[PDB]
Amino acid sequence: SGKEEIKEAIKKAVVRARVTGDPKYLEEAKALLEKLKELDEEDKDVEKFEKAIKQVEAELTLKEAKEVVKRLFEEGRPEDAAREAFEYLQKLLDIGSPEAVKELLQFLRELL
């Protein structure tokens, strides 16, 4: 009973974070997952929810990175754009998402 209600709430927050882009649903999902682990460390769905939360975090950072670097290159600020691109690359590597890192780099080579 109580364990599935936590899992449904996690999925709903992950969906809300993706459709709205608001990171407050991501921090809500992390809090619910932390309650799940303390309830049952060995729960078979802990690993799945951990990956999904990282996935959302990479997606939100990737979306913000694409908007900042594209604008700074458009407005004639190549040095400011590259500096932001390196830091957003660092943020995606810290998060841990090879797909998001590969997409950002592909996005950058198409810009230039």
- Contact (Cβ atoms closer than 8 angstroms) between residue 97 and residue 58: yes
- For the record, the structure tokens of 88 come out as 């957003």
Resolution (A): 2.2
- Angle, in degrees to the nearest 10, between helices 2-20 and 24-39: 160
- For the record, the structure tokens of 82 come out as 């590259």
Q: 55-60, long-range: CB within 8 Å, 24+ apart, which pairs?
A: 55/97, 56/14, 56/17, 56/18, 56/26, 56/29, 57/26, 57/95, 57/97, 58/92, 58/95, 58/96, 58/97, 58/99, 58/100, 59/18, 59/100, 60/17, 60/21, 60/23, 60/26
Nearest-5° angle of CA 27, CA 28, CA 30? 65
Question: Which technique was used to obtain these atomic coordinates?
Answer: X-ray
Write the DSSP assignment of 59-110 as a string of letters.
HHHHHHHHHHHHHHHHTT-HHHHHHHHHHHHHHHHHHT-HHHHHHHHHHHHH
- For the record, the structure tokens of 47 come out as 């690993």
